[PDB]
Amino acid sequence: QRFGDLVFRQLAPNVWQHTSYLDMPGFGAVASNGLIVRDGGRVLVVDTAWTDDQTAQILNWIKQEINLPVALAVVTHAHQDKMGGMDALHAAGIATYANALSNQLAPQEGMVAAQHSLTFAANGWVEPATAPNFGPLKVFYPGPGHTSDNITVGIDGTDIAFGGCLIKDSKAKSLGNLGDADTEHYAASARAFGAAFPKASMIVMSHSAPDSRAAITHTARMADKLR
């Protein structure tokens, strides 16, 4: 339609969460979150919706609500929830980025790859040459947890960090879908995320409402029971 079926919640003066819902037989209405970030006179987008239509809606909300050009998007992992609307971005002329491993996994997940691949220093930090002018966006790769390619981003100046599918809600009873999980490293990855963004007080979840640092702690402890 025109942004009418996605939820957009203000999370900081310059940050908003986009939530869209899957409509697929055999599935419930499943929420997926990404972020929208105003960085001065430009917007940056973390993730897409399930479909191009939902993703197009996000662009419209930006256009109506913010009215600043959309400079880039990053996708945090390869699956329908975050990568589904890739082509909506390219159709719009938006430069997209993903972990190299993600772009390579996109086809086997039935998704279109981002235009550009991110490579990471052994630090776990993205190579500034592969992610030019990301501004406040700070991109960390903790290693394999929930999936092999899961990346996470921090938002400078807000004390918000986005954990992807990595961090589950502090009320989570399980780690969920351990199909692409890495049994051995999942606890260390979770904790490395926490050290990576030591100041962030709000942890945006992939599916649920934003949480505190306790979710990080909860996750790691659940993953200790994997080994």
Numbering used by the authors: 44 to 270
Q: What does the literature reporting this entry say, word for word?
A:
NDM-1 has been reported to be a highly potent carbapenem-hydrolyzing, zinc-dependent MBL. NDM-1 is an extended spectrum zinc dependent β-lactamase capable of hydrolyzing nearly all classes of β-lactams, impairing the ability to treat life-threatening infections with intravenously and orally available carbapenems.. NDM-1 resembles the common β-lactamase fold, although it shows low sequence similarity to β-lactamases deposited in PDB (20–33% sequence identity). Our results show that NDM-1 is unique among other MBLs due to its enlarged and flexible active site, and explain the observed extended spectrum β-lactamase activity.
Three of our apoNDM-1 structures are zinc-free and are the first structures of a wild-type apo-enzyme in subclass B1. No zinc is found in the structure and only an acetate ion can be modeled in the active site interacting with His250. The three apoNDM-1 structures include two pairs of monomers A and B and one monomer A, and the structure of monometalated NDM-1 (mZnNDM-1 Δ36NY) includes four monomers (A, B, C, D), respectively in the asymmetric unit, providing nine crystallographically independent views of the molecule for NDM-1 Δ38, NDM-1 Δ36NY (monoclinic), NDM-1 Δ36NY (orthorhombic), mZn-NDM-1 Δ36NY (tetragonal). In our three apo and one monozinc structures, there are nine independent representations of NDM-1 molecules with different crystallization conditions and packing environments. In these structures, most active site loops show very small conformational changes with the exception of ASL1 and to some extent ASL4. These are key loops contributing to the expansion of active site accessibility. In apoNDM-1 structure conformations of some of these residues are very similar to zinc-bound states (His120, Asp124, and His250), while others show somewhat different side chain orientations (His122, His189, and Cys208). Cys208 exists in two orientations in apo-state, one is similar to the zinc bound state and the other is rotated about 45 and 90 degrees in chain A and B, respectively.
